Subunit: 97 residues, 2 copies
């Protein structure tokens, strides 16, 4: 590994995109070379994080898919000014094989 | 003297109510006798379950509050007709002391 990408490879952030975009994205990552991927979401985006992984584990690979770890908690992040805001963050790590 | 027997109430379900109703409810439960309460939510209601407990642990009791367990997963429930629907369920158990 000597490339160095500013773009994250194994971590995705749930924004305002339709769930279908994230589902196909994770599937593409498996065939791209990433077997363990972590979907990170926060606030009201938590609902999509689970919705995405639930589809992925009950559609393309059910028996063969495996869970790695699931953690939910409030993270201290900074606002646009520089204000400490606590936001409920969730890291979902799944293992594809 | 009464002929009314006590009943166990330690689980709550997140519906369409504002978060302020759940926060105060959990606080009332502690002073009512229930130190360990489990907030159960599902689907798009997952966001309120965490939003509620986050406020409760960062307002009234921060240091003294303790987490018991957190589990998220799809449960197989029946629809109004009797159709098997999988829905992303979450059980958040906290310990108030």
């Amino acid at each position: 590994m000597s490339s160095g990408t500013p773009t994250p490879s194994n971590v995705v952030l749930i924004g305002k995109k339709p769930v279908m975009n994230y589902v196909l994205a994770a599937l593409t990552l498996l065939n791209q070379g990433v077997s363990e991927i972590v979907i990170k979401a926060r606030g009201r985006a938590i609902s999509k994080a689970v919705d995405t992984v639930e589809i992925v584990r009950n559609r393309f690979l059910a028996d063969k898919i495996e869970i790695k770890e699931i953690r939910v908690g409030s993270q201290v992040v900074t606002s646009q000014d520089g204000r400490q805001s606590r936001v409920s963050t969730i890291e979902i790590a799944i293992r594809k094989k």
